[PDB]
Symmetry: D3
Subunit: 231 residues, 6 copies
């Protein structure tokens, strides 16, 4: 494929999708055995290893709908990937979303035009694969990892002078990130299974930061949940 330097069979059926390629490296090296790096193009690293004797890949996506769409399209079309699980963070937009909560996104709102380009007057609501989502939910509940299931907002502008997060929060949306709408829409368009699992980076509307320690803990929880979502 144009943006991924891998060969046939180098990428697993299941791929974890962090935004940051240095986090892709950290995940593969920390969690997986027998790791190979299959992609270095643009420094957007992808790796394959095993977790409990099963092949798992981890591929950086970059930031924003256009970047993740490139990787997701190529993973699906050129490498026949079946399960695509974004592991990332989001800015919480509600007080009831606690700093330790792991978020499972059922769906996402967006200000991307990607779906209006396809559907015009239709509002297309992307949808997580329920099997993946339920497995992740079960894995969290089994261990006592706090988990919140709901919707997120996929933003094009990290710095948005016209942000509607205040109104989105009132409609129940949990947090803002920059990827889910693309992952969910493209996976479904191709009959593959997708899920986004997210930690909280901060509360955007209070400016209130999460601490390095909190972030480390939630990151590990997210990855543990991810490594129990297929099947």
């Amino acid at each position: 494929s144009v943006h991924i330097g891998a060969e046939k069979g180098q990428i697993a059926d299941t791929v974890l999708l962090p935004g940051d390629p240095l986090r892709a490296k950290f995940i593969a090296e920390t969690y997986l055995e027998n790791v190979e790096c299959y992609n270095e193009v643009r420094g957007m690293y992808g790796f394959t290893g095993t977790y409990k004797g099963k092949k798992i890949s981890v591929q950086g996506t970059g930031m924003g709908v256009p970047s993740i769409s490139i990787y997701v399209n190529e993973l699906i079309q050129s490498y026949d990937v079946q399960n695509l699980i974004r592991v990332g963070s989001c800015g919480a937009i509600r007080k009831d979303v606690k700093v330790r909560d792991v978020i499972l996104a059922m769906t996402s709102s967006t200000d991307s035009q990607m779906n209006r380009v396809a559907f015009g007057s239709v509002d297309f609501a992307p949808c997580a694969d329920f099997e993946l989502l339920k497995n992740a939910y079960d894995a969290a509940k089994d261990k006592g990892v706090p988990v919140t299931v709901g919707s997120v907002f996929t933003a094009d502008q990290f710095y948005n002078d016209d942000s509607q997060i205040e109104k989105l929060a009132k409609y129940g949306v949990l947090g803002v990130e920059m990827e889910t709408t693309a992952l969910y829409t493209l996976a479904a368009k191709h009959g593959r299974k997708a899920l986004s699992i997210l930690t909280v980076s901060d509360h955007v509307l209070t400016g209130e930061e999460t601490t390095a320690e909190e972030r480390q803990t939630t990151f590990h929880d997210m990855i543990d949940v991810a490594l129990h979502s297929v099947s």
Copy 2:
């Protein structure tokens, strides 16, 4: 409220929401004990009775986003309703949606302008309450009722010369009805819990009808699932 003739406390915390008021009557009389009719305004009947010693209401909504929005807004704002569960049907738009499947909607796409009126350039993705959805899913699985969890499309035009159901089906959408986007959006806007449980009326793209017998069976399954979704 303007469209519902009920008094304080006449409507339960939990309301089932069929589109047809004659089905509301059928549900209450067939499934509930100690039934009172609290509303006859416009013949859009609403009833309250008990199921296993717990108060449950059943309120007809009429057809289409504008009609259900009236009832949902009044139930929430004037009667403090907490759980709102649509029980209806949809036209299946995929072969893999079988005539006997009970559909739990995680979200819905729409050609209604209701959310663009509020959000403009944002595509708002409505979201089912996961607690209700999971309870319904569990209730179906416990009994062996076939259940499919995914998205639906909320149409304004039952007869639509410009229908995009072919493309929607390719993106994984299961079926078409005329209510879910409104129920989900309005419940969330007011911090209440909503879920749509749907049977298949026909396969729209093959014209292939469901039989009266199939419809009777799936209807009963839907109601049984509904009467186990709260808690």
Copy 3:
């Protein structure tokens, strides 16, 4: 047809279209002779009788563009209906619209997406049939019934947090209801004749109610005008 249980010839060339099926019943029983009920599906009653020896039908439409569109499409396509006259109410949005005025709608604005779904960048302006409108106007003037001819707004949201009625009133729009755009657009698309005749339910921007007595009087005036609009 899918939503109307009538047989061939049971519905007249001319159909009055109240939103409330209990008002359809009231109209037919109060004004017509030799009345039969041809439809009970969903309790959305339709009746046929005679007025001065001429067949006239009265069919409830439900509330909102999607509901009336179902009935109007089926009346036209399955029953070959020629003249379709909505008889209903609207919330007045101008002081100069008096509580006793009968409104004849020349056209309607809307926040429904129904016409953008068909036309995209075009603003489609629906148009009353001038022959029906002029007959109704003549009938009102002949008796001294106060009549105001102008435009209305067809709303999807009876409860609209983003209402533009203040600006609409400044542009001369008379009142808000939930049906006209659909009736006018669908009748014209099929080469049939349509008109909406409306009474005032209240002044929305002053909250000021109309009294039961005023409403009874204007209702009778509206029906009398309606029963003189064909020919």
Copy 4:
């Protein structure tokens, strides 16, 4: 005003609005007595004279929504004009619109963004003043001038690669011109009375021309009707 060189009281309460300033000249000189030219700015002539002892003005508008909007805004705001009557032509888009028919526009569709700029998600339907329209209709009927009352389309692009006139004709729209939406919207916004009276220039969808003789006749009919629309 910026684009009209007239002084206080030089423009009458009633102004006829042809698109072509050379037609404004022709109308005033052919139909009115005691004519003065009050405007020569940009060669967009305006004239005032009397018809049966009553002051009448005739002001060229130029072609297209932006041009007519300039003149209409200045006539209303700077010269306190009360009645604004466009007299022009349109391309017929239906066979049933005959070459000799004088068209009275109840409303107009458009591809101009002028009303979406003001209203966003609302489709604003402009509305003729019914008093002017009815007077014009009466004047035509009194003399036996064939008259057709319905809607038109206000186009921004005389040469439009993306024209929807075929679909507009199916929805009953009579003909295409480039002014009415602006005249009707701006007059109503300012509480003034407007009407467009139109002849047929050709049948756009058959290319079939109207002859010079036909055009002369219909032009005179249009002006005669116009000079009987106020009161």
Copy 5:
């Protein structure tokens, strides 16, 4: 062509495009030798003469996208015009745009729907012909005429209650006029070369007028630059 009364070869390869036909007359008579008027239709004069022994035409366009689009389309399609140079004015929307600056428009924003009608979800950015623009820039610099190169806004509404000029100015837009988007888009669509050269009529956001003397000077500068932009 429909709106231009000229014969084959009467219009030059290069046409200057003022909005006001009386300015077209003034330009041709003041600057060119051996002038013929080739068009008087609608009083929208067009002239051809020579400048330094080379044929040059000057054609009034009227005001607004729809009017200029008519002339530009006919000049290109019926008369094979190659170079189209608008010479007009604009209202400056920034303090840094000085009253004596001659503006060369690289591109223009708009509230016209003309390009959304063609492209839907795409924002089409019109583009000046760089060869013409560079020649004009060189001609200004050679003589010491102050010149500013940047973008303008093409407005449909000279009187716009919903104007966004304040925000446009913040994004760097220089001034507002009513033509450029159409000229640039239509010329490019047909493989011809276009440029808009503009003087400042006033500062719209300070109301501060330019004086008659300033306007005379800048007008002459604009025309001198124009008569050195081809080649």
Copy 6:
């Protein structure tokens, strides 16, 4: 700043903006002296060195409007960057765009919603800084580097089922990339100077590739032009 790990003064007044961080590294190491890497966050490298004794930075942007917007916003707001020059490639959409042409973008069209989010009904046309563009043009012409000045299209979807490149090419657009609209809009919004200089990656509509050798040559030409655009 959130995504860039640099300290005060580590980034120059002038920054080159390749999409690929490994190309940022290649540019700085190949062309500049005394190079320091100031950013390794997300592996999106940024470097500062000197070219002919003047400080120059080179910062990877990632792919797509959302990614470049993050870097451009932080460079401007946190590091006070003055001149921002994207150096990248695009897919040519016209035969007349030759494989060796260096493209200077005057403006860009887009299917990103970023500007509709800010402006709604306005089509915002981004604009290159003419001073930078002219310097780059002069530098190319001085050496005989073939240069083409015109517009590009900024795409959100590298793989777009609904691509309009065929129509865009007919309107004169040169090529497709994924960044320019954001760079130009954000630089102008903040009063900074921007330019995109682009090579041809392939002809998208003929599939016809550029060779490795051609790409190496054009890359060097682009960088040489870039290192002569300020002043």
